[PDB]
Design a protein around this ligand. Structure first.
Ligand SMILES: *[C@@H]1O[C@H](CO)[C@@H](O[C@@H]2O[C@H](CO)[C@@H](O[C@@H]3O[C@H](CO[C@H]4O[C@H](CO)[C@@H](O)[C@H](O)[C@@H]4O)[C@@H](O)[C@H](O)[C@@H]3O)[C@H](O)[C@H]2NC(C)=O)[C@H](O)[C@H]1NC(C)=O
Ligand SMILES: *[C@H]1O[C@H](CO)[C@@H](O[C@@H]2O[C@H](CO)[C@@H](O[C@@H]3O[C@H](CO[C@H]4O[C@H](CO)[C@@H](O)[C@H](O)[C@@H]4O)[C@@H](O)[C@H](O)[C@@H]3O)[C@H](O)[C@H]2NC(C)=O)[C@H](O)[C@H]1NC(C)=O
Ligand SMILES: *[C@@H]1O[C@H](CO)[C@@H](O[C@@H]2O[C@H](CO)[C@@H](O)[C@H](O)[C@H]2NC(C)=O)[C@H](O)[C@H]1NC(C)=O
Ligand SMILES: *[C@@H]1O[C@H](CO)[C@@H](O[C@@H]2O[C@H](CO)[C@@H](O)[C@H](O)[C@H]2NC(C)=O)[C@H](O)[C@H]1NC(C)=O
Ligand SMILES: *[C@@H]1O[C@H](CO)[C@@H](O[C@@H]2O[C@H](CO)[C@@H](O)[C@H](O)[C@H]2NC(C)=O)[C@H](O)[C@H]1NC(C)=O
Ligand code: NAG
Lengths: 448, 144, 48
């Protein structure tokens, strides 16, 4: 009935099969297509193109080649340099631009027509800052990998001012994964409460080097600022004594989601993981999980505005596409329970601020949910912690020996003072001065 | 439009978002790209045909780190203005590890120049050794 | 199994009553902080 084309800019692989985001995008177009209630009457056509992922000029033509053919929404380059070029293209010619990975949103770049389904590191850095207060740390240590990473944690760098943390920010060495000189210096500094900021590939390779230097013991706790801690092979580490906590937005409890993930690993047909990688085999990363949810947020909007048609836009002869402005408002007001919980956007700039994290940690069973974070709420932890009992029973025998006496001069009488006293200091005379000597010898506490 | 007319070298847009686009253009078509302001050079962006005459904040952040050792500070305080600014001083943020500094990084409020609530909190914390990271326009308005 | 329970740290020292400690692959353990001492009667110095 209706043909509707989407953008398909992805990374150019040349030897192996296509990337996890492109497979997620090919799957999400195919999944909605036979599912004829959600988008029932339209024939969504993917238009995939491939860039070298570090060329804004190559991403510029592949954007224009899709709009010269005519699309509805480009579903994002996956790098900060190339996305900013295509964001300026989609802002000018009018089409929405759907983003699934984080970038540095420039505060003076007044743009519309873009949303980012990745959870914002403004909101995430609260949740790490909430989590370090739950464990009551004072000697935290941020380890990042890219110079971009200080932007991604800037609310944590800005908090020795308000709270009592003492940040000791370090950087992984570039051009390698040999972080052997780093963790030796971190063992020397007794860095016991490390917060990593890595991808899940470098989060796996940092732990084997942490294991080989014996640095994963009972008095090391690792917070991973990532959303794919659950996809690590934690089997060498499960008995190690190491506490390690992360976050997860991917619902592993919903049977609808778990049906997709079970269907995913079958439909991958991907190059097998090396056992020296340290990763588990069949799981959706949070990169491909959002790209699956990227189409479904758009698929809500095409229902509520069905009269939209495909127009062939020209970059050189730039014209604002007339259906986009109406279509963009349905995107920013969309609500959908995808793979990553609810997806609600931001009434300001199109970032994702209100979402649902599931704070997971390592116990001897494996990874395990020990709470839930929310921006509107705080930590809803003390999920498994239960009660905090206490029992000491001082006043050794079992009392501080209630002494009954009576006021008589000069034996027991009230003490004269300018300030009125309270307790045992009220009384003076012979017999309490006797009783202070009896309490010194026998070693008991008394209450007059 | 300049290369369709034909030029020798584009002398730079003056912003990080717009320069990265033209840097990819000058790398592809071959002309040199001459830059006069700093940007975040992405470490995985393998490009040629560009030079930046602005002094790199990798090299500058040594000189501030040399200068705080000359005055023998222990209670420094970085105040920046843009979230870009943590990249411009990252060798100073990475040095309570090697030396004995104690960084207490703060940020100027956006959408204004009214930094009245900031310096009240900095006076309360006895912040006596402030390192600003501003443009010279905001360096004037912060002192009044 | 001592590595997988994180028990090879700077404050564990293992004496092996064996004469083939030298034939172990100690490469995962060399940086671990663990002191481990043994004995060897086999001369690895003699060129003969
Ligand atoms: C199990 O016990 C051994 C001690 O009985 C551990 O030896 C430690 O680790 C290395 C391995 O040899 C030693 O480093 C050597 O040190 C010498 C001396 O120069 C250094 O002197 C002091 C140390 O007091 C140090 O502060 C300096 O910076 C020098 O580096 C060097 O000449 C060698 O080249 C080599 O670097 C350690 O010194 C030694 N430490 C202690 C406290 O004994 C052995 O490694 C243990 N097994 C582990 C930890 O897995
Ligand atoms: C890192 O610190 C964490 C605390 O923040 C540790 O979580 C600890 O988990 C350990 C066991 O992994 C627990 O210590 C003991 O374990 C039982 C729990 O077993 C429950 O599950 C079994 C299922 O087989 C079942 O029989 C019952 O439902 C049991 O209740 C506790 O109930 C005991 O009281 C005992 O403490 C703790 O639950 C928990 N806290 C502490 C302080 O141990 C984590 O394991 C730490 N890493 C370590 C110790 O290596
Ligand atoms: C086509 O998609 C619709 C979604 O709009 C499916 O209908 C419901 O999907 C939700 C998914 O969260 C289930 O929880 C409900 O139970 C579904 N409703 C039912 C089964 O009545 C619909 O199932 C899909 N089509 C097919 C053939 O499965
Ligand atoms: C596609 O087009 C027609 C347009 O009339 C569809 O008819 C309606 O479609 C909407 C949304 O898809 C439904 O909510 C209505 O219930 C449909 N019926 C009526 C009477 O309005 C129809 O679904 C499709 N037709 C074909 C041949 O595929
Ligand atoms: C934190 O945990 C849950 C989040 O759903 C809230 O209550 C749960 O749901 C019902 C109704 O209250 C009850 O079974 C229990 O109270 C909870 N069940 C669990 C934890 O399994 C709870 O109120 C939340 N607390 C907040 C937000 O302060
Ligand atoms: C998104 O909405 C929140 C309120 O929930 C508010 O901070 C603002 O309007 C938006 N966030 C940002 C960072 O602009």
């Amino acid at each position: 009935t209706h043909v509707l084309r989407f953008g398909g800019i992805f990374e150019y692989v040349e030897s192996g099969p296509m990337g996890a985001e492109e497979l997620a995008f090919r799957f999400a177009v195919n999944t909605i297509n036979r599912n004829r209630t959600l988008l029932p009457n339209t024939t969504l056509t993917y238009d995939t193109q491939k860039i070298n992922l570090y060329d804004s000029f190559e991403a510029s033509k592949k954007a224009c080649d899709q709009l010269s053919l005519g699309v509805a929404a480009i579903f994002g380059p996956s790098h900060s340099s190339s996305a900013n070029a295509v964001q300026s293209i989609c802002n000018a010619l009018g089409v929405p631009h759907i983003q699934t990975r984080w970038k540095h949103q420039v505060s003076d770049n007044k743009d519309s027509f873009y949303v980012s389904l990745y959870p914002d590191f403004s909101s995430l850095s609260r949740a790490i800052l909430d989590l370090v207060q739950f464990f009551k740390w004072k000697t935290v240590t941020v380890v990042y990998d890219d110079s971009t990473g200080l932007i991604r944690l800037q609310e944590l760098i800005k908090a020795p001012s308000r709270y009592n943390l003492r940040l000791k920010i370090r950087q992984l060495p570039a051009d390698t994964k040999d972080a052997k000189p780093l963790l030796k210096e971190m063992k020397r500094g007794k860095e016991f409460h490390v917060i990593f900021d890595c991808s899940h590939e470098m989060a796996a390779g940092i732990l084997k080097q942490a294991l080989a230097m014996g640095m994963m013991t009972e008095y090391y706790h690792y917070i991973f600022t990532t959303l794919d801690l659950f996809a690590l092979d934690v089997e060498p580490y499960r008995y190690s004594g190491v506490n390690m906590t992360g976050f997860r937005i991917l619902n592993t409890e919903n049977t609808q989601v778990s049906s997709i993930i079970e269907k995913w690993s079958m439909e991958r047909l991907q190059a097998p993981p090396k056992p020296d990688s340290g990763l588990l085999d069949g799981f959706m990363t949070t990169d491909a999980a959002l790209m699956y949810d990227a189409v479904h947020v758009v698929s809500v909007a095409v229902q509520q505005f069905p009269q939209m048609t495909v127009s062939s836009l020209q970059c050189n002869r730039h014209k604002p596409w007339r259906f986009g402005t109406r279509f963009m408002s349905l995107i920013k007001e969309a609500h959908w329970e995808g793979l990553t919980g609810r997806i609600t956007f931001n009434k300001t700039n199109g970032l994702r601020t209100d979402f649902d994290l599931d704070v997971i940690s390592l116990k001897e069973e494996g990874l395990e949910k020990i709470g839930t974070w929310d921006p509107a709420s705080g930590l809803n932890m003390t999920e498994s912690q239960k009660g905090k009992p206490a029992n000491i029973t001082d006043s050794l025998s079992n009392r501080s020996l209630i002494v009954t006496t009576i006021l008589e001069e000069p034996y027991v009488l009230f003490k004269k003072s300018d300030k009125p006293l309270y307790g045992n200091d009220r009384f003076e005379g012979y017999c309490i001065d006797l009783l202070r000597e009896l309490s010194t010898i026998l070693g008991f506490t008394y209450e007059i």
